[model samples]
Target: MKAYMFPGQGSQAKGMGRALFDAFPALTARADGVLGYSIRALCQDDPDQRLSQTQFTQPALYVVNALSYLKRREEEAPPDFLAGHSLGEFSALFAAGVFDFETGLALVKKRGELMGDARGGGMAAVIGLDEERVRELLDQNGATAVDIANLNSPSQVVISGAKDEIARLQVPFEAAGAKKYTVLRVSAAFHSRFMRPAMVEFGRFLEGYDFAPPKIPVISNVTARPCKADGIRAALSEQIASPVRWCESIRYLMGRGVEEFVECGHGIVLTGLYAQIRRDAQ
Candidate 1:
């Protein structure tokens, strides 16, 4: 079986989906109508302006991924399972037929805005570090605000916390034998306690939406398992302050006979991580 994965925040690029939009006029119109802007211009021309902002980036990537799915469908493409990284979860749900494109795009926009508006945080990618060692450093430094965000792979993890706390952890994280670490250029520290307010509001917002059972299984970021309708809503709500169980999610899919994985959105980060895990396991 194959798994169709969606890329998250960092996968976005300025010129993404330009060719697809040009080739498929109907998709262009739909995207333009839903987003209230020229999808072509935002994606192809002004990438710097479009990608750096939360509102534009989320919806933009969703559109690109959705369009890609459409193109693949035209060729009779289908996957046995679906999953998404971070913001891409909504796209995965859409792909699984939980909602229409418009609803997915709209919800993603709101999620992005809520997350972006959240205060007091930053995220950093730490490479070649053991999770236990990293946790030890955070505990030693009294870094109460910091928490593991994404367990992308065994040696690749992301941490999120208040800006000062994140900066303070860098030296200690490296001292704890991290091969490399770099701060992400994000507006807020997502998937951490700093986003509690957003999480609370998002929980309320999610209540009014309708969700249908997915045609295929969708691994969730919060739980690393196939989510039911209620599980879907709960996972999305709790994901704001919960760590992303990406490594576990990948493992779960692999356990379910997902031999080949295809990342449907922007970057190859997920693919690269999966390759690393597979190599290590072998």
Candidate 2:
């Protein structure tokens, strides 16, 4: 069995949407109008490097991902499952027949704005430590203020919290046997309790929209399981301040008979993670 996956924000780069923007000229124009900025300009020039900013990053990645998925479906059979990481979830829902490209773009736009508006948070990647050890290290080092932001792989976990707390925990993480601990260059601690306000705003924005049941199940970043129609709205909101259970999501798909994964987006990040996850599974 196969599952189609989408890339999140970090997968974006300076020249990602060059081809897809022209391929879907009409939709690209719609995205520009909705965002009041050119997708082509952002993806190519990256004026002031705004492409890396969450507000701009979310919409640009979403549009590019949508186009990438449309292009891929032209040649490949739809997969049995669809999944996404962080902002990539919008693309998964679009492929699942849940919402149109335009609406999904709008949702991401607002989500980005709300999250970007937040202030003073940090993130760091901890390699060579499993979830259990990560938590133990946190408790052992008095770094309880920090939160686990993402479970990227069996031994790759990202933590989010105040800048000081995050920085202070690095030595412990490394001393606890993490191969490496690197701080992330992000403006806010996404997928943590710090995003409660952003999540609330996103919830309000979602109230104005309607969603359809997926043609295929869409594994969620928060739940690491198939998202049902009724639970979609709540999950989307909860995900804002929740750790992304990416490893669990992949394991869920594999457990459910998914053997192949086609990552649809600008870069090969998710696919790279797939290789790591598969190795860990062994």
Candidate 3:
């Protein structure tokens, strides 16, 4: 069995949509109309350097990932399962026939905006520490404000919290034998309790939209399991303020006989993690 993984924000880069934009002109134009800018120009040139910003990054990656999936389906069989990290989940839903291109784009645009609008929070990447060790360290150091953001692999984790709390973590994490502790460039504390307001607003926004059952089973980042169709809206909203359980999601797929993991987006990040996760399981 195989699973297709859609990468999230950090995987984006210049020229990712190089040929994809031209390949889907109508969807491209519709995206531009929804975003009020050239999706092609932004991903291709990024003249304003806004591509890295969460607001722009989310939508751009979504469009590219969506297009990438469409293009892949033309030449390849649909994978047995689908999953995504963070913003990439939107792309996964698109691939599963949950929504059309325009509807997904609109949701992504709003999601990005809400996430980008959050302020005074930050995130950090903690290497060489498993989730339990990281949590123990946080508790030992009185870092109550922080939240574990991403369980990317067995040894790699991301934490989100107040700016000061995030900055104060590097020292202890390093001193406690972390291989590396690096602050992320993100604008807000995503996938943390801090995003409650955004999640609430997103829930309200989601009330306006309707979703269909996934034509393909999709493992949710929020649950690390296949999402029930009726729970899709709630899960998408809750995910804004929840950790991405990527490691467990991969393990779940592997447990179900998914031997091959294919990334349908720009970077090798998810695949790289798959290697790490697989090796760790051994």
Which structure among the candidates has the greatest lDDT? 3
What lDDT score goes with residue 260 in model 2?
85
- Model 1 misplaced stretches (Cα beyond 4 Å): none
Off by over 4 Å in 2: none
* Candidate models: Cα lDDT each: 0.85, 0.89, 0.93
Better model by TM-score, 1 or 3?
3
Scored against the true structure, residue 130 in model 2 reaches a CA lDDT of: 90
| 1-282: candidate 2 lDDT, tens digit per residue | 999889997888998879888888898888889888778898988978898799999998898888988888897887899999999999999999999988888889888899889998899988898999998888888886789999998878999988889998878777778899999989998888889988888898899888999998999988898998998999999999999999999999999989888988888988888898999787
In candidate 1, position 88 carries an lDDT of 82
Ranking by lDDT: 3, 2, 1
Q: How high a TM-score does candidate 2 get?
A: 0.97
lDDT of 1 at 206: 91
Please give the RMSD to the true structure for each candidate, in Å: 1.4, 1.0, 0.8
Tens-digit per-residue lDDT, 30-66, candidate 3: 8999999999999999978998898899999999999
